[PDB]
Symmetry: D3
Subunit: 317 residues, 6 copies
């Protein structure tokens, strides 16, 4: 409800040292190679939706681990090719896939795919639980980079871009990526791991500066990590777990992004604390802007919606 | 903190109609057949533990879906065969597997294995997430009995009994099952699905009378189901989910338990509401006793521990 | 979080006696006469908005008590006349007037004005505070129907319809009204007080069955009334206040609605309790449907948005 | 419940720069001139009250904007003239005007008037809502000094002194002002804006050091300002709003007070944070004392009541 | 915040069977005999207090168990004899003995003593803790009527009346008793155990219908009893504790009150639930009135203070 | 739930100046002399308990102020002498004396006595309430060292050691002391005041660095002191109360301990804040180790149980 993290003057210069291990780049190269071995085999199934001016589909494709990934895909009912958006959603926060949002993005003139996150909403997570974990997804497979939950998720997010760009009706040169919280971290991960996106808008991105997040966050879900360490108390487990996390920490991916990025942060956000978002932002080495909202937390920011629409119109239209 | 469910006189006669589908028995027969196809291949690894009078091991075996299930196994350091206990734990509630508790059970004279639940603590869950679920395990695979989370868990609980009974140092004719909440539901399930247990103690059992649970509970984790319906709103989804749950509802399993049962319930328990526990109890057709504690909720009840120790001494020693 | 009001079978037949005083109709006739004395003098000011396919304006008009009422007005950028919607907002719940929502309604093909409520957001409330009130608007002027806050608000809601219907680009025979909570009460009030609307959608309407609302609600803002009685304890004050409220209670207005109505209610809604909404619904004498959502409270219900879009497409297009 | 603001050693030297604009003095001169144009036309109406030794009245007078302002006025039943007190009340915190308190002040020998704040309790607020505001009074008319809620309130508080001093039975040379929270800020405002008061006692005064208050407060009602900025997000609105506030910030008025002042602060007060009260106190340039209570918050402090009674006896008797 | 106990029509006829044991009267006769053995030896020590019209003292006397009981005693500074009041305070709710309140009672014309409760504030509790109890006083000595905390407290309350009536300046034929919650229970107890009071006012009395209180209360301190049963689980302990409590339950004492009684209850009071207060009220057989306040809980009710002052003026002056 | 106190690097060097008054040592010498004047007169009463391998008793002895102190005493069913433990319990936190814990300690091979704290559980507190105090035991008799609650408690804890060591079956040279929170402070007090213990294990000890605890604690029960100062506001009372506390503050006793000490602290513990525990630890001048658990609060720490068992096995076996 109120200020809690570092003061803004300190946030502005907050830039922790990268925590990427020596084999970080090799890990991601190998991961993308694993993804490439699965044929996408995309399937569009039309959907009845109560609107004119748009055609709505259920898009399904195959991704890492042969997982079936799905979401709503909405297209302007006009001759293309169209600019496009892949939209990523918040942690445990998709209610029937946000169909109405995707439709509205299409009515704004974007062929839009709302990728649903494996295991959270509609999409399948074929990765196993190798060692047991705290309630939630944050510590699933955390003892090894190869088994960690977000490995499959990040690869799915790249694959979404490969699939949508392959469509005749989408202009592969004008694709944006967007989302908030988990959706914002997937936005930054996708732009770091794929050359497809032309521009990125990330609301208060999650999955950033893990070492600080678990010490400063006051709400879920970063605190699932804390919960995992309570239930698995070995000092060696904690060291391994933090190392695994560092391959997915968007502050370590951020220097790979080479397109324009617009980002938001609300200063009272206790879920994705300001410091962790400034850390990601400050590691970006690209055309970038951070919109800071003093009185907002982990939530829809109306002013930023205006910024987002103007940014995508500028870069994709 | 205070009374909230049906008054006692109503609880005493609360016996909802069974919700088991016509193919309930066949489903369990077929699930047991799938388990039987997997060779247990038990492995005992000695552990140095700071106590005399007991030998402590890490026990691992294979179960449904080729899952590696594990736990601490503690044995009186004296000539057997010994009476034995399989102990099941609460939802998301195992902290390094309760090694100290298992040791204490062995110092009480019982060869004791604390089965750790697949995906929650140490043990592997090889079952996939076929459709996306609310945060937690309660709705994992809920759209099909064959994929539902507790299918594997129940089978693992049966497999624990098969493994322990097979050891030379355990008297297979004097094995008890116990646990609280999730652990109490697994106790009833194991006693319903296996002829190995001689007697059972279930503290405030979970996984009971789901249709009422989701309408009366005031705390997690029954409300994960509610969360899943919020995120997946189709009426047909809800019907299917409840149908799936009815195969695992211990009130439907309860009439298969043929051994003595001691059960508890705290009348201010908002997690496993009294009415849900009375439903399970009232469907038992076996020697049974329910201990009702007016002033306790979802928590350790000292007086019931005395009852439990006395019950197992009576039946196993 | 959980069920709390009357069970469904009771809600279905919950129809309290109307509380309208004998001079209820005359009061409304006289209030409409006062409104009619004020020339609307509508003013449209174009806005640069970052979307194609729509024209966006700030619409201002004059209303009861010479109040300046305003909102965003968005129009499909194509040849009219267009179907139209007047959208009303929740209590204290407008953030810069929902400009993005109004634009989206226009991209769906509806010339749409989001009336901002006098004193809450942008619009002027010229009505005085004659006697002092509890924090909020609910008890402002409550000691006299003529001075009560929602007198002006209801008249402004009627005036919005008169203004929009008067535009050349709007088809006056295909205007809908919609809104949630306070916005849903205004929807019903506008449909009761004006023959202009063709159809109405009200999400969980507020301002209904006040005598029950203040005894069953568990959250703000019905409880402002309770707060006012705490601060102004005279028995005669309470009688007068409830009397005032009965002129504005939508259950008393409901039988004047002559167009099709779609309504929602979440069964765990502690703000606009189910019983209060069923009362309004059950007093409608018109083509109507109430969508009941077991697992939702006072919040956005995705499935109802689909229903709403389908309803307006059916009735307006 | 616990310490939260600056440590006491830092509080003691906390004295922010004044934020008064260049036309601050002219604004107040003009405001008082506006007040002077309204004839007070005071009216005393006797009241039945169950006590001997006091006569109780309802005092009504006209003030700025022709507003009817009222409150209970209690007088020692003995020949005067009497020393007198004007008592001001907390935000939204008067329950039927605190008649029993006023009577007790009269039994202590003071002709006492408890001014009730326009719009909050009994008294009329004739000032309009020019632009819409967040729930409450704190942001009503905040975009212009001339329309801002506290302009009328402060002028009413001065007018109360003019009215009571005009009574034959009150000794105009022995009038105190007192109150807590909002009542304390009105106390300081009245003593800064009027030469009538002889002495002032302010409990934990509100309306002080606004820039800090909205960043440090953890309870209502300072946080209404934050709420207003959430709903009206333009950077220019925020700058205007803070400027308007600065004409009413008692830290800017405080250097005008020329009578003895006694003030209290509780160190755990999260409504009127210690720092904001120290700011007001430290800007006083008069005979002054601040009583600091480590273990008290926003509440009645028994020890300070003793201090208050002794202070008024010293200065008014 | 909201209605929760039996509806009013049920409260009005709620009259549980008395729970007094067969030796209830003899216990009280014997307890009064024990009190009588202790010479009161009253001591008045003048206090300098900053008010005219009253003389203020610290009054100390000896009571049951040779306990030193004390409080503030304030007297109109004029020729007596005076009507008098003994005021009893709430549980753990005395802050330096309410000196200011006692003074105000004296300025209203009543020689007033605020008995401070042994062990809670200033006064000594010489009774031991014979068996260990839950945090608080409610279960201190609860295993035996002779050792129970409120035995001494009730006797001290009777002794206060004996002491005050013995002063030359108090008219022994015009003494009232008053207090709220714990203070209201002591008011009823004192009126039941002593013929000295002429009339009694009890705000929402505590210590009533214990069997229902511990099943319906939602706040401390009835729930201390529940806490004691959690910590001391023997069924025989609970039976004995409830038996002890029945000697002190004011519903069992109520039919001994022979003077006029005015009582209050707020219908949202979760501390002294309405049903518990109606039980005490309904067992009175004397001139009586219960004032019911729909919108108030366990708190100061301004309107009731007017009733109380009017009642004592009627009966004592 | 999250970090709140000084950062760990600062905790590690946190060592406040001792607050022991000049007569600290003399006070304790005199206190122990008072204890020695009471003959212990120990009594063992056998108990039925459902276990083999242990004999269980109720041990009662007489201590300071002729108080009857009791608890469960469990002995290995084998020929001794045995190593032994005296276990002390948490504030208001013993549920029927933790019989099952004591039995388990005996099954681990220790003759174990769980001393129950006078007035809290089973044991009698013969010390009176001399002046009235806040709800709870923390401020009982706080205005004088001689009457203060913990004087009797600490002496009881020493007497427990004298009694158990006197038993033929216990090896007086191999006695440990242990407990958590209040139990941990009694552990340190007992080892400072008695030469009997061979080794000590204290979980997150309470009763330490009082001046800081009341300023940093965010939960009960340190905050009872704050509550006492609210209800007894004299500056002199506060100075006296802090002085009394300093004779019992284990940071002042700690330098007297001459046996090995193992201690734990959880970094999110808001009951016994990290700083207060580091203060005690840092004043120890003996063989010592502090186990710091980042993710744990005021609760059972499984890893530390392993540390505790290994430490006692090392030092007592």
């Amino acid at each position: 409800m109120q200020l809690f993290d570092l003061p803004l003057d300190q946030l502005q210069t907050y830039k922790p040292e990268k925590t990427a291990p020596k084999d970080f780049s090799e890990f991601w190269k190998l991961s993308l190679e694993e993804l490439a071995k699965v044929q996408a085999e995309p399937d569009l199934q039309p959907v009845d939706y109560p609107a004119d001016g748009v055609k709505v589909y259920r898009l399904t494709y195959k991704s890492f681990g042969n997982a079936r990934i799905t979401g709503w895909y909405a297209v302007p009912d006009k001759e293309g090719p169209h600019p496009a958006i892949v939209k990523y959603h918040g942690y445990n926060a998709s209610y029937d896939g946000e169909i109405h949002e995707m439709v509205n993005w299409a009515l704004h003139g974007y062929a839009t795919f709302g990728m649903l996150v494996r295991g959270q909403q509609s999409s399948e997570d074929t990765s196993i639980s190798p060692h047991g974990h705290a309630l939630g997804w944050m510590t699933k497979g955390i003892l090894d980079k190869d088994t960690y939950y977000y490995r499959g998720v990040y690869l799915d997010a790249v694959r979404a871009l490969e699939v949508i760009s392959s469509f005749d009706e989408v202009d592969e040169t004008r694709i944006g990526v967007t989302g908030g919280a988990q959706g914002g971290g997937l936005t930054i991960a996708a732009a770091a791991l794929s050359d497809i996106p032309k521009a990125a808008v990330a609301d208060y991105p999650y999955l950033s500066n893990f070492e600080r997040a678990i010490d400063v966050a006051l709400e879920e879900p970063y605190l699932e990590i804390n919960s995992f360490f309570r239930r698995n108390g070995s000092p060696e487990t904690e060291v391994q777990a933090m190392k695994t996390l560092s391959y997915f920490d968007i502050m370590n991916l951020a220097d790979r992004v080479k397109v324009p990025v617009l980002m938001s942060i609300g200063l009272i956000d206790k879920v994705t604390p300001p410091s962790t978002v400034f850390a990601a932002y400050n590691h970006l080495e690209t055309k970038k802007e951070l919109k800071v909202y003093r009185y907002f937390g982990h939530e829809y920011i109306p002013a930023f919606q205006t910024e987002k629409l103007a940014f995508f119109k500028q870069h994709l239209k």
